[PDB]
Amino acid sequence: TLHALLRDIPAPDAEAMARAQQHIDGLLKPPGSLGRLETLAVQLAGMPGLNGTPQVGEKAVLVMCADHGVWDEGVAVYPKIVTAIMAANMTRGTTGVCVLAAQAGAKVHVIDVGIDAEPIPGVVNMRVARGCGNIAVGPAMSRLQAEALLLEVSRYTCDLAQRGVTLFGVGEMGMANTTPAAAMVSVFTGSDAKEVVGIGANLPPSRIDNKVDVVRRAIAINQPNPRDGIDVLSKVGGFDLVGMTGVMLGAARCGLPVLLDGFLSYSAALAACQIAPAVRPYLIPSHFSAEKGARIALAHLSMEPYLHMAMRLGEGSGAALAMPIVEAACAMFHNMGELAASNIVLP
Amino acid sequence: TLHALLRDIPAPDAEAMARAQQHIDGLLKPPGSLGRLETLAVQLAGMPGLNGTPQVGEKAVLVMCADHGVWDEGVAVYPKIVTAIMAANMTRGTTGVCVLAAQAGAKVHVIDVGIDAEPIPGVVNMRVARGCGNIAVGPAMSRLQAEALLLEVSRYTCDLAQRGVTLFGVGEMGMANTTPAAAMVSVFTGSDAKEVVGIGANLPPSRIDNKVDVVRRAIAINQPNPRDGIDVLSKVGGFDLVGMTGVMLGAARCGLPVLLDGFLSYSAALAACQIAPAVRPYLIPSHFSAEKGARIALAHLSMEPYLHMAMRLGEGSGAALAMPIVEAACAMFHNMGELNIVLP
Numbered sequence: 001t002l003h004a005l006l007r008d009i010p011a012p013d014a015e016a017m018a019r020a021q022q023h024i025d026g027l028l029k030p031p032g033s034l035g036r037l038e039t040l041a042v043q044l045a046g047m048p049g050l051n052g053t054p055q056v057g058e059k060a061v062l063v064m065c066a067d068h069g070v071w072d073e074g075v076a077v078y079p080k081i082v083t084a085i086m087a088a089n090m091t092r093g094t095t096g097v098c099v100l101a102a103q104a105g106a107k108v109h110v111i112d113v114g115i116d117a118e119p120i121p122g123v124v125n126m127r128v129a130r131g132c133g134n135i136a137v138g139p140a141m142s143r144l145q146a147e148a149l150l151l152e153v154s155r156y157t158c159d160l161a162q163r164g165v166t167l168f169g170v171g172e173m174g175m176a177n178t179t180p181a182a183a184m185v186s187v188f189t190g191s192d193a194k195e196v197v198g199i200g201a202n203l204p205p206s207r208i209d210n211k212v213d214v215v216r217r218a219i220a221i222n223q224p225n226p227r228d229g230i231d232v233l234s235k236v237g238g239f240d241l242v243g244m245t246g247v248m249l250g251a252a253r254c255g256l257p258v259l260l261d262g263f264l265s266y267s268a269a270l271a272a273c274q275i276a277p278a279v280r281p282y283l284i285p286s287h288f289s290a291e292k293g294a295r296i297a298l299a300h301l302s303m304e305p306y307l308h309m310a311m312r313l314g315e316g317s318g319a320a321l322a323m324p325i326v327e328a329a330c331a332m333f334h335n336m337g338e339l340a341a342s343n344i345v346l347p
Numbered sequence: 348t349l350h351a352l353l354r355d356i357p358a359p360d361a362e363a364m365a366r367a368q369q370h371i372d373g374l375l376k377p378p379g380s381l382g383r384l385e386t387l388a389v390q391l392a393g394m395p396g397l398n399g400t401p402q403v404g405e406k407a408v409l410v411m412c413a414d415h416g417v418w419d420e421g422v423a424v425y426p427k428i429v430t431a432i433m434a435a436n437m438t439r440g441t442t443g444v445c446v447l448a449a450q451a452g453a454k455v456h457v458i459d460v461g462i463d464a465e466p467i468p469g470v471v472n473m474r475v476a477r478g479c480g481n482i483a484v485g486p487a488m489s490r491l492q493a494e495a496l497l498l499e500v501s502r503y504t505c506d507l508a509q510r511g512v513t514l515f516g517v518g519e520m521g522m523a524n525t526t527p528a529a530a531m532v533s534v535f536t537g538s539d540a541k542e543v544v545g546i547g548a549n550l551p552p553s554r555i556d557n558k559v560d561v562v563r564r565a566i567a568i569n570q571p572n573p574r575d576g577i578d579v580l581s582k583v584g585g586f587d588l589v590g591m592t593g594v595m596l597g598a599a600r601c602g603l604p605v606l607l608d609g610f611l612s613y614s615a616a617l618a619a620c621q622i623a624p625a626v627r628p629y630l631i632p633s634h635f636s637a638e639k640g641a642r643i644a645l646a647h648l649s650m651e652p653y654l655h656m657a658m659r660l661g662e663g664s665g666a667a668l669a670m671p672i673v674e675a676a677c678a679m680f681h682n683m684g685e686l687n688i689v690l691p
């Protein structure tokens with residue numbers, strides 16, 4: 001069924017997009033003057049899960065939580081248990097993503113794809129293991145484990161669609177997870193680990209050299225194949241990154257838009273688009289994160305985010321922050337008046 | 348009274364800002380990790396009208412509408428009557444700013460500061476004249492007219508604080524008004540007209556040279572003094588631009604935030620900050636407009652917008668689009684949970 005999911009991602013509706021362009025050109029403004037709001041509306045109009053038009057019903061941010069073996073290499077400043085503490089706080093509404101999702105009218109789904117702690121009540125259990133393998137010394141997981149989790153998360157995602165969610169955001173929580181994110185970005189883009197490794201959650205600058213070394217070691221011991229995104233995810237990714245890629249595949253299969261977040265989400269999007277290029281028209285950037293490897297990842301996705309907030313929290317917080325932008329494109333398209341009704345016509 | 352208003356603009360509250368920063372650093376996140384949302388929350392905390400804390404109550408976008416004598420010089424591609432048509436469409440809720448304001452939960456106040464038409468019922472009447480003077484041949488208005496309109500608009504704006512408004516946005520409507528906007532930007536920044544004259548509302552590129560010529564003419568003829576922002580507005584501005592400056596002065600007098608829009612609003616902000624430097628801490632950029640002079644104007648304001656939408660509609664549309672960012676800063680500050688746990 002993974003083969004089938006990938007094969008059956010629909011093409012966007014080019015004919016609806018052309019009708020959308022013509023409609024937007026007739027709205028009460030100089031043609032082209034709403035810029036990327038116009039192109040965002042046309043992008044939405046082509047998503048087959050919507051109604052031929054930009055549309056926003058219910059909104060969901062899917063936050064993928066897991067721990068990482070590579071935390072053992074000293075690449076993170078916070079204690080391991082913070083992943084579990086933060087997942088529990090997600091159920092209480094006290095995290096950055098919760099507060100911003102609430103403001104945007106979106107629901108947060110907290111998904112445990114492999115936290116190294118006891119199960120947390122209120123969290124969706126999709127737990128592959130208690131943390132993934134330490135990527136510096138071997139693979140994060142087996143190929144079968146990565147494929148199974150991709151299918152489970154894609155299915156959970158498209159079930160939300162059947163329930164009326166029309167806009168997704170993706171996020172994550174996982175101490176040390178900027179390490180595998182950087183390894184994937186290096187592998188997919190061909191960039192040296194040094195160009196894409198940053199401070200993550202306030203790693204002291206003195207410790208960056210060790211982190212670059214770890215990323216290189218992970219890449220060397222595993223030999224991830226850039227032509228096989230599932231190989232890359234399984235080898236030098238993690239459960240959270242696989243789960244994020246699964247939300248993108250699910251939403252695409254369902255013909256629905258998904259907002260990216262920051263660097264972790266850019267790395268998962270590089271995997272998803274290598275796995276299935278048909279995913280790409282469904283992705284919407286939110287913000288340009290303040291993480292070192294952001295520019296390179298975004299360049300490889302040919303993405304220009306809407307928001308420049310110097311944000312680096314993760315969790316889906318930037319995706320939630322951008323939800324009103326998607327709603328604004330819809331509001332423009334459906335609620336603006338038209339040039340012809342005011343008899344405004346130029347030669 | 349305009350002198351008194353300017354003198355009485357409060358300083359931002361350093362103590363409140365220090366308390367806000369300390370609170371933000373203790374939230375459930377790595378320090379600094381919410382970036383400019385943090386800095387915005389602190390900027391808000393300092394504004395005395397907000398009573399010590401980032402908060403947002405009611406929201407209002409003030410859209411300043413007027414016609415321009417310089418339309419006669421061939422600098423605009425729409426008929427002059429489009430100003431009046433659009434101001435009336437604003438009362439009906441069908442314009443870009445209306446639809447985006449409604450999405451943001453804000454009210455649009457449409458204010459006629461000098462449309463060349465009969466008054467439009469349902470539009471706020473602060474009309475100076477039926478269009479301003481053609482800046483290509485003389486001044487837009489007298490100094491007294493500019494000063495009177497600044498005071499009137501500033502008073503209207505701060506009076507909105509009584510109805511619970513805590514967050515303003517500014518906008519305009521006025522065919523040809525990107526011509527005076529470029530003239531003012533040229534004067535304040537020292538840039539040649541060619542560097543700051545754009546297409547406006549889709550002016551054909553073959554008509555750009557003429558627009559550049561008109562801007563230079565206007566400056567040559569009027570000799571605006573860049574160190575006297577009221578002189579610049581009155582000479583090579585327009586009633587809409589003066590109105591926009593007045594909203595900023597009134598918000599600052601009230602100790603309250605105002606979101607800018609695009610190039611017209613940057614031009615009015617440069618005027619406002621020259622008139623009263625104390626205005627500056629109250630201004631919040633929205634988007635980086637897709638207008639030629641934007642980068643220069645924003646550089647002179649030391650401003651880096653949050654949104655990169657290639658937008659160039661004006662009307663306050665970008666200000667409205669940014670209001671949820673201000674609300675996000677307030678939500679972070681008041682609703683997030685709070686944290687020697689770090690590894691050596």
Ligand SMILES: Cc1ccc(O)cc1
Nearest residue numbers: 028029030344425548
């Ligand atoms: C049709 C039109 C023209 C200019 C403008 O600012 C808005 C609408």
Ligand SMILES: Cc1ccc(O)cc1
Nearest residue numbers: 078082201375376377
């Ligand atoms: C305390 C903390 C650390 C990391 C993180 O992503 C969130 C909160």
